[PDB]
Subunit: 344 residues, 4 copies
């Protein structure tokens, strides 16, 4: 025999709600085929309509599934269905089931049962696709969540967002400032206090070594690697972030460091800057315990100003203070919003 089932979704994004369902259906079959359906214009409207920074590609999405069901990749399959031109959901099944059928051929599989919620699809599935259907928790008894709720307010529904997607819904807070090191501790204490992650300044060991005598501790061709490692860090922090990820330094800090020590810029750091924007950038100013430091900060603003980097500069007299000021803004990110130079 060999039972075989299908599933359709937009998975924009994928929540523990879908996830659970998919496993459920999977325990009822020997082989399950999971379809990620996209609509260039529809998807596009949902993205812009939301407040998501970057938009998840079809690839980004397929990959989420591809990953979530890796251990079972030998039974659970994942395909992409393109529904462009095909009339809006309520009615188009004739036109839709066409492509579905097409997929089933060029992908060589014939499902005989479909899983879902949205009862309103049973008959139609039965009609145009002619399959046995099976409702599964439509009342949302388990996993009281939706792609729209998460897409609208990520933080209120965080426990429902799989770690594969987190990158499209987490917020990164980068903290620029002088070698004060107060930064790093503050960056760590914050993550601690907010039960979340942080991503150190990659190569901080040499930064401190240079800055000190050693002119060769950090040189022009080092920067690229340094940046790339700082990236490895950030990604772990996001992958595991609770809602926000504190990032010690940012790529601009690295491009700043370079320039100051070589007079040159380095196209690679430039590229990184444009590739990995941050959600919130905070600038720390101090002046109470004289060198070339004031020059770095000068340089940071200049570089920050270019690139059009929205940032909110903090000035403070003592540690404990700075901590509060920052903690304050963050608190507004975890809820409130619209900052830009903050409500001060």
């Amino acid at each position: 025999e060999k039972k075989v089932g299908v599933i359709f979704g937009k998975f924009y994004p994928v929540h523990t709600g879908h996830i659970n369902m998919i496993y459920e259906a999977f325990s009822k079959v020997d082989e399950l085929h999971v379809i990620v359906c996209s609509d260039t214009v529809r998807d596009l409207k949902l993205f812009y309509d939301s407040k998501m920074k970057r938009m998840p590609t079809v690839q980004d999405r397929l990959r989420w599934m591809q990953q979530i069901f890796k251990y079972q990749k030998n039974q659970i399959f994942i395909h992409h269905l393109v529904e462009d031109g095909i009339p809006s959901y309520p009615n188009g099944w004739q036109s839709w089931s066409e492509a579905v059928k097409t997929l089933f051929h060029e992908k060589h599989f014939e499902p005989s049962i479909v899983f879902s919620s949205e009862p309103q699809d049973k008959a139609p599935y039965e009609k145009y696709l002619g399959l046995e259907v099976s409702l599964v928790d439509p009342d949302r008894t388990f996993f009281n969540v939706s792609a729209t709720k998460i897409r609208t307010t990520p933080f209120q529904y965080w426990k429902f967002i799989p770690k594969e997607a987190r990158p499209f819904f987490a917020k990164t807070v980068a903290i620029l400032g002088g070698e004060s090191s107060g930064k790093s501790v503050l960056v760590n204490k914050l993550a601690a206090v907010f039960n979340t992650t942080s991503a150190w300044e990659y190569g901080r060991e040499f930064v401190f070594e240079k800055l000190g005598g050693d002119e060769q501790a950090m040189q022009y061709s080092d920067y690229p690697q340094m940046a790339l490692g700082h990236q490895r860090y950030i990604d772990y922090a996001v992958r595991h972030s609770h809602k926000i990820a504190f990032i010690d330094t940012d790529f601009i800090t690295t491009q700043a460091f370079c320039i100051q020590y070589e007079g040159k810029a380095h196209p690679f750091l430039d590229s990184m800057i444009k590739e990995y924007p941050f959600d919130v950038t905070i600038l720390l100013k101090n002046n109470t315990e004289q060198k070339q430091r004031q020059q770095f900060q000068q340089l940071l603003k200049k570089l920050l100003d270019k690139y059009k980097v929205p940032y909110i500069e903090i000035e403070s007299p003592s540690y404990l203070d700075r901590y509060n000021q920052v903690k304050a803004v963050i608190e507004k990110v975890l809820n409130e919003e619209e900052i830009s130079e903050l409500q001060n």
Copy 2:
């Protein structure tokens, strides 16, 4: 010059409160020495007084620190101080500072400053050890927590327990039952619903292969490895557990499997059984959709009964039901307690 500081603690256990502090002190020094102080009898009373399953050894403790501050192991050091015979805290400093001094010699380091909270120690530190002292968040402004609070009610203070210790405060729930597979899905759905982890049945692929024809899919010398892998799983689940970790099958299930198929027992599975007890063991019985299954369950109870394994057997007519029954008990673990055959 080269500034150098010390810290004393019992770290029973270690919370994000201590952790934070230690980093703080660390940013004020080039080299920090962290002392884990033990008292055979004192420690012993605290353990038994609590409701912790296993007791953390001196090694277990040193290792927590050893690990938490691994990346900084080149500046932050960790030592063990034995305060047995030395009179109870309030007064004994003369007798205590003796050993401290002894450590500082046989460990070749001379700190010149000490960090802590508990102001009541400044003068004494200044007195008997003669060091500069520095209060740090005594009001517990950040990290409103204590070794006693966590030691008393782990779950209420979970966000304060580092993942290194979790094993001594998390609870494992093992679910025994037939090949029903409903187990596995249920075991996963549970972890999902409770935003926590689960540890699959290692080698489930072959279990299902055997059980089916293939008598060679799982044979006597396989068991040891199988068990050990199931262990790798459990440990990840605990290391990352939210408060509880659902464990598909247990070592007894493996020893049961063996016996049934070889007539023998296997000393190794036996050892594993006695080494890794579980916090809660749940037994699933079914009888509504006839083979040799009833024999396995029979065998499970026999093995469960020996070993003195406290367990609570669940009987149920349909999936959705079983789910509720289980979910019920769990809910009592996350709060209430004392079950043993449950309040039914």
Copy 3:
């Protein structure tokens, strides 16, 4: 359409020769099914006939394949075929192709092409199974190797053995001796000199801490974990061994340590001892630079003697010497053999 191919083998063991082939066939199909065929008695004769320490189970074998082709597990499948009762290779195809057919049904796949070498199978495959066949490097142009060559002399054909199997063909050399620490360095220098791996003594840090004052640095309930970690180490060393893996200490050393400090034994260490034998055990004696050490060595021999642990004791006056003596024996393992108390 959807092309689909099969492959048959004993894979006892699996060499880069099979591996290569399988990928080759895989690039010619959309879906490849790889059959591991076993014969209780045949396999059994091949094992005993060889000089392999432990025998690879059907599970051990399926797992090798299961692993080697993990990334492709969604297209390349692996099945077990039982050919017991079925007449010896040359003739039995009628009886053999029966089961093959049976598998193809209860496993729901119908291949239409078979890959192999051994031309002598084309017609028969064409005959009894009726499939298109395709020779692939029968002249062994690439991968001049065989399951028998490796099974006979592993070391001469090491470059052909995948790391998944290495455990069944690598040799472990454990080195027991006093805290001399000369051990560890020697154990490392050896691996270095022989461009191979080594597996440290897990928890050496505390061993040295105990042995010194700290009676609580290593206590009875620590041993189990310590052992298990030492195991994690050994396995990495084997997984990556060049031909041999130097192991600092052995499980008996741990059971010895225990006894000496608790008077008890600990069933768990006992189990480990019986589970993980070593290929060569070397004993280091010294007496030139008085404590309780002579007692440990005494204890090691007593424990070694029981368990029936074949071992070769080395006595030496200075480091450089010991190094040569050891290096000597090893050299005989990489080639010659039969030692037991060595050729001295």
Copy 4:
């Protein structure tokens, strides 16, 4: 007391010879300080004098040590000594020992013994630094190797180069060609045959999906990640390369793919191209079993030609052939050299 030793080196590069030594010295001390000494102009001459592609920075070097002795970072330390202006080796000790002394202060450590080979240094060390010295294998009995031998002919001394450095001495061979897929298999078969590694084309799954209908399977903003993953791969391949690492596709192939499908280029791919050159680039042409393929190859040469990418184009009628042609060139890399469009 607390014994403490130093070591000086250029470590250009670091071989298992140095490594071994350093551990040796380490077993004779409680704390060892390892100095990496650089000379802008000297180092620079050694690099150019050799045939190394990229030059190891001071950072690259410190990091090698920093890494090799990570597990022991709490006792073995690593420092950088700048000997610029200080007269050439044979004589300058007065001027050299000055800085050494300076380091010992600003780095707060006072060694009382020095390790090395090169006896000719004992007295001088004794003289200008006044330390107890200790020869260690000067006859190069163990580890018959030198920084110059490796720096001159890496492959002949591969077993002596730690995996941390491999990147500066391994060779990467990238293989460009059409979706033929013959590439990938060939790229893998090569690594197999040469007992070495390979780094697949990251995201090959979608490449093949696009190329086929799916215009959304791989879009403009995907490229950056794709590239970066292909990088993760290459780095593993080098880190573990035997002497050479076969790389499926190269960054130009990715920039080519982009352009062809968006008409644009993407600055990021551009940056990657300039950052990660390859040692040998091979181009595969085919014309025997018509689409838009000929256009890609056209595009590859255009992009290859720009960037000034030295490449050797291979034309061949059948697989087996191509394999030989390639295998041929490689064989010349493992020994001979100077190719550029090859000796054909």
